[PDB]
Amino acid sequence: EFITVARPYAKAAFDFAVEHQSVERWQDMLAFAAEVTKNEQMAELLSGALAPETLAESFIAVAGEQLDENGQNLIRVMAENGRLNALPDVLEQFIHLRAVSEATAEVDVISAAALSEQQLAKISAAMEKRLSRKVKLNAKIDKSVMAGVIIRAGDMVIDG
Amino acid sequence: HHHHHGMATGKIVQVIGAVVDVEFPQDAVPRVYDALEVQNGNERLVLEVQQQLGGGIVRTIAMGSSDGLRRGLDVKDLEHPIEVPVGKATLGRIMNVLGEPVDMKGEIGEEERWAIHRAAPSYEELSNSQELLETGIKVIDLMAPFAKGGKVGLFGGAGVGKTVNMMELIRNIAIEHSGYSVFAGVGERTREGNDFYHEMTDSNVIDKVSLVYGQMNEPPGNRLRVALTGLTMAEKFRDEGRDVLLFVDNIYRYTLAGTEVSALLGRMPSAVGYQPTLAEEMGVLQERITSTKTGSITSVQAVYVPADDLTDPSPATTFAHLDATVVLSRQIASLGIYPAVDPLDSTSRQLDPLVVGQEHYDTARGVQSILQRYQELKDIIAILGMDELSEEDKLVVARARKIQRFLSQPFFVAEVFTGSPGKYVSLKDTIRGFKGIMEGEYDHLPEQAFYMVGSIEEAVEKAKKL
Amino acid sequence: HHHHHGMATGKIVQVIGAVVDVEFPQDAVPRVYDALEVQNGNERLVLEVQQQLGGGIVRTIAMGSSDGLRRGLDVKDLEHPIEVPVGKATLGRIMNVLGEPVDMKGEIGEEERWAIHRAAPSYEELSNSQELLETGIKVIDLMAPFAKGGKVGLFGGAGVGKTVNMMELIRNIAIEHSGYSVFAGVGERTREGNDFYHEMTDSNVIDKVSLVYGQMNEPPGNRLRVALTGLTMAEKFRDEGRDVLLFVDNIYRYTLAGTEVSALLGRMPSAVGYQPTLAEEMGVLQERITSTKTGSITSVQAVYVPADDLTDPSPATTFAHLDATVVLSRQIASLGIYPAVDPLDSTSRQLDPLVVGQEHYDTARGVQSILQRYQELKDIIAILGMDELSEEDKLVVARARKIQRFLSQPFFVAEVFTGSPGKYVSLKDTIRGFKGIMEGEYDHLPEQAFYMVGSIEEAVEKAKKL
Amino acid sequence: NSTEISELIKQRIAQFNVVSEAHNEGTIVSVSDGVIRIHGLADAMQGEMISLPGNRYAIALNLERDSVGAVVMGPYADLAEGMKVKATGRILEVPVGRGLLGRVVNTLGAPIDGKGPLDHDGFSAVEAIAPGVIERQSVDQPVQTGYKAVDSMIPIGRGQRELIIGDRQTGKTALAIDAIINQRDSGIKAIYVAIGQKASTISNVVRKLEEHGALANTIVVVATASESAALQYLAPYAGAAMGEYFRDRGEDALIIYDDLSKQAVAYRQISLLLRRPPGREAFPGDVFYLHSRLLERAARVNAEYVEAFTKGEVKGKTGSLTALPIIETQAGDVSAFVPTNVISITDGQIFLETNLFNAGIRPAVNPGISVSRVGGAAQTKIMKKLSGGIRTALAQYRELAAFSQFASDLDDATRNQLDHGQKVTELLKQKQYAPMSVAQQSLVLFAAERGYLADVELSKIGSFEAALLAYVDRDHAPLMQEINQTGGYNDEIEGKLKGILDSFKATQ
Amino acid sequence: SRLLERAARVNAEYVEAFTKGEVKGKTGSLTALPIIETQAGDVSAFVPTNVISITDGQIFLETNLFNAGIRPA
Amino acid sequence: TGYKAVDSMIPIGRGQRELIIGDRQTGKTALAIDAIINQRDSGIKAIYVAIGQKASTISNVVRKLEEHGALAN
Ligand SMILES: Nc1ncnc2c1ncn2[C@@H]1O[C@H](COP(=O)(O)OP(=O)(O)OP(=O)(O)O)[C@@H](O)[C@H]1O
């Protein structure tokens, strides 16, 4: 729930902190530390602390303690400054923002999320989406092809 | 002092002048704004936490600001709540702030410090004295009579009229009583300690009264610290003896500091940056100090209004929360009268019919009707002139101008501040002279014969001899 | 409007409204006048950064608009702040608001290209003696001693107009004193430019004045930015050997654009619907038109007050920032005279007092006392009758009517528009003729033959030759 | 890394165990032309000055954690967001010293146009406090204001506190231009704080005020339109820097102030631009500070205050601080918090009427509205005992003559308000550059108080009687100058004034 | 309009009131006196217009009659 | 109530509401207790709502209101 405060944690840790081989520590530390307090015990019991050493050291060093310098420094600075109260977009913002150098994801053809490996425009979407293999799945792929002509002809010709 | 130990409030992290925030542990907060001894830059300064909070960082209230101190200086506090002086031992020396030395002599007072809040009696224990007191003039001693125990609120500050009413009222009221008092004094001028304090401190007048000093060069917390010193000496001296009068003045520091200090502490405003607790402080501070069963407290209030500010909370709160609601209009002082006081604003409770009499009823009815008709006949006698006039314009103008211009006179201190002499009038000539000058008997005098006249001796001798 | 050197900067972020929040460089922000020429749409819309911020998104404000831009417009870095084109060669065509033109081509005479932000007030090398000026008229120079390079205010309604001041001042002041008199304009009409400019073809001033008007079809930042053209273009001629003389239009564009733009940006300012930048712009811009060692910097203070608003900054800034303020009513022009400026309330502080000489003191005292003492003999005496008309009524009425109707000497405004001559009135004839022959000497001039005469020099031969 | 800080975000989010921010320096977070947040500064003092980029004493507002609001002197819009500052030692280091009189002094220090070399005692505190209670006695001494009624009616001594206000476009800044030439020396080094001047005011006031009199004992520090918070709103508070070298030493101290309310708009940035609270025309309680240790410190010292403030130097003398502050009223605009607090914080109040000040009359003082603090206390024997009834002429003549256009006030009794009423009230008025001293009050109050030069004196008789009697009596007798040496009101004043005035005025 | 709406008299058909359900609830009058102590007839706010306009009675006084010399106010 | 015009020219009913606006220092709280001899001596179940009082208001109002005919009514 950072929104505007989510660009600094995802953009500032994928450039200066990427030289120390921290590509796997951010996913396990952010996913484990952010997902470990998603129940009804660590969030209400750790978010209502008085100091930052008890919530940061207990919440970041008592539930597995699978962190190092980035986990203790990021958990202490984020918990003491006010950023560890939610942290729900750390995995999506850190993974999507840190993995922007080789991001290859397409869209959907009125069916299901295929997520093709197309890094550029019309890369692998034509061969992967037109070279069956798979042509129509069970998620209303072939049945949704008549929505354009049926909705366009019926909606555009419904006025008379 | 007497443990006054431990405390340990930590260092100041967010020092924003008077509203500091020293974070510490969980047990580092004052009890209802207790005393403290924080060692900032000078010495052990007090820091009463007016608003408690968690973590130790509370909204403290001190006298001076946080100028010169750093954001890491460790300080401390105190365990006692109130530890000042409250007694009749410090009479010849002025009490500084709480009860230290302000003048040349040192003030000590009583060692047994009581509460820092005034407490009056209940509804069946308040001995309200109904004794009418007369002044040394004619209109002030014959118009309305204030009773003992109650404090007459006088609106209007300095810059137009305050020394004439406070000097003649304080000198005539303090000299024409023959008793004990406990008046203090704060918020005066810079050179008032060598002129005003020299006469009362050198003329054997403050021998049985706990006086105090204080100019207008104090801070925000130092000028508003008169509640503990005034309530402690007034509540302790008013109940430990028989009688203890007072004469409070300079209400500008309490209204400006109390009404302006609430917006700088995090709270919301009220009326153009005013305090939201004016009824509790004005009603509790103005109603919790009256005449009790242990002793009468005939105090004297003086509201300081800025440029005749009669539309704020001082006029509405002081006009109903106190005894009389006097003021200082510019029409009396701008015309060159010998009174310079608004006598047509309000009066006392002994000016009706049963407790008054034929003199006060006939003088109040004739003076009110003649003054209202003559003062209200300007729409037909000012624009049109003397064309459509008759007996009402000459009789109302002569009776209202002669009674209003002859009802003012000096009162010792009011005599040396102008130029005319001072003569003490009586109640028989002033109360009996209204049925002759405003009827047709003593209406043969002119405008020069009624100027600076007492009652009937100065008007009859000056009008018949000159 | 800045010299771009590099063309880098970065992208943008938000673009809601006129707030240019583009993220240019990180730790390489520019100055205040150094605008970033961003490529928004098709044109290079520059935005002046009023307040720089960290990160890249600075608080910038553009003049016009982006003409449809996206959320990530590319910007460009600059080097020289406020690099516009001006100089002393602008007297030839109409100018724009960014150093370009509005009439023909040539960017209002392309010459130099220095900084657009000129210096306001300075001393040392500047002229601190503050010498007086002389326009060369009998009802402008002899009645009001203006200073050399001052901001004289103007009041009144119609009567004179822009053709009389521009035509009469574009030939007498241009030939009697070396200098180029330019003009300005902020908040005009769209049709007046198609008519008033025709007046430039009737007096030959277009080749000696730079018309810099912004009309009113643009916004506040695009039409109120005419201060750099006058100060940047007028400093090249006043600091070289000539004397610049600008002319403002009104104060509705600077007051409405400054108060609305400065108060509608999310920040508090002054009261009564005013902004806090009125003292800096009025005090810094009002003191910049002063005399120097290389030429006097004069400017026609044609500010418009808000219907005589004494509580706002129009009467205080206009009456306290300018010097003399002449008023022109309809009484002097409704009778059929040449000059519409009356002699009442149209003088400076050093024009009627004892800080000039016997000519200005005797002419100002005799003309002011004769006009004020003679103005009531023809208006207040007309309701009764002319039976009680002695030597004061005939001499004061004949001298006041003949001197008032004959003192309006025609300048060079009607010499190339109507056909009447007159050349310019001298100070010896108006100062040595209106104090002796206009009181009670040489009563041979009538009312028809005394009209259209140059001060008192041409009125002597008209009494015996016509 | 919650906030975008690039260096501090990655360094603080990746290595929070090493902060190292106790040097009381660092840099700045942003710079919005004045409102700059100084980053760090944990051990720095709150309110202390610090030299940042350039030459400006940037002082912090408060010590709220590490985000202290620094205010640099001048415009900081051209610099980028990230100015590196230095250490914050201590503030209050203005040029204190009474020995710098004569040279040009500005609001920034001792460098102005054109004499930038002023030797002072040392850079110390400028905002002085008030005096004590028993050690604050007013010294009664005589002085010359500029006219006979001003110096004989309201004689303000050294160390008084009165309020003065002038009419707009009538004479609120000049009027009496013979004060420096007629008063010569004002005790010690003089001062005059002003806000709003240019080349014509400094050149005309410096050339006119310095060409007639002695300008080697006056250190006026005025300001133009390009003034910041320490040069416009802080002009009246920093004017008591050299006073400690004059008032707190044994001698007296002269000071003045012009246009005090005009700088109040400069405080608007502390109420509007700082997002604070507003009151009267968008202004907070900072003006109330002027009633604390600023304008309320104009009081004379006593005998015991000269030995403690000077660390043993006088021991018997009494100091004085004559700081008369004036203001330019907008046609009688004095009904707000500044007029009530400024007029109520002192002990004197004087107002100038705009009826006779703009009609051509020399008498710009109002009748009955002037109520000074001293008046007859600091006057001599010829101004308090013989000329003590100065209010009866203006009050009796104005009140008796302004009776809605009356006929005659008892005929003969109206002679003092119609016939000979203009010879003592309208004729005794100082015009443009008119000096006055003890000869005008002693000669005009010791001879024209009975009927020698006050009965038959009107227009021609009033001008010829005063000119012939003053020229023949002042040029024929030599003992009259002795009346300017002592008090007066004895047999020599009545005999010499009556015999010299009657014998010298009987043959006019 | 909620707490100040108890200024109406009940009838004899009200069986509730106090005792249910015959007597002790017939002619039950409930008078109310809204004598507000204003500042010389100061009535130009939301409480004065809403309270004075939402009720049925209206009365005012003046200080000139009681302060001039008469007994009535 | 207690006057001649309050029972004929301005009479109120049992179970109605009438708003009043007394002037300051004239007939605000003094006219509603001083000129009320019929309402306090006739015997009616009234209820007063006093907000903001002290020793003089409770002593003068209790002694003056209890020393007439109401007291315990
Ligand atoms: N009482 C007076 N009678 C006649 N002339 C006067 C009087 N007082 C001042 N003057 C004239 O005023 C002139 C000085 O004006 P000054 O520069 O003080 O105006 P100002 O104070 O700048 O006006 P403003 O306050 O409107 O800016 C002098 O030349 C003097 O002749």
Ligand SMILES: Nc1ncnc2c1ncn2[C@@H]1O[C@H](COP(=O)(O)OP(=O)(O)OP(=O)(O)O)[C@@H](O)[C@H]1O
């Ligand atoms: N019925 C009446 N007729 C004439 N005069 C009256 C009457 N009732 C009271 N007064 C006058 O009112 C005066 C007392 O006023 P009081 O102090 O009670 O006003 P108050 O209750 O304080 O006003 P407020 O309620 O507005 O504060 C008495 O002097 C008396 O003469």
Ligand SMILES: Nc1ncnc2c1ncn2[C@@H]1O[C@H](COP(=O)(O)OP(=O)(O)O)[C@@H](O)[C@H]1O
């Ligand atoms: N009875 C009176 N007659 C004439 N003048 C008076 C009278 N009382 C006061 N004054 C004038 O009022 C002025 C009050 O001055 P000061 O004490 O400084 O202000 P304040 O009275 O507001 O404190 C005095 O100068 C005095 O001349």
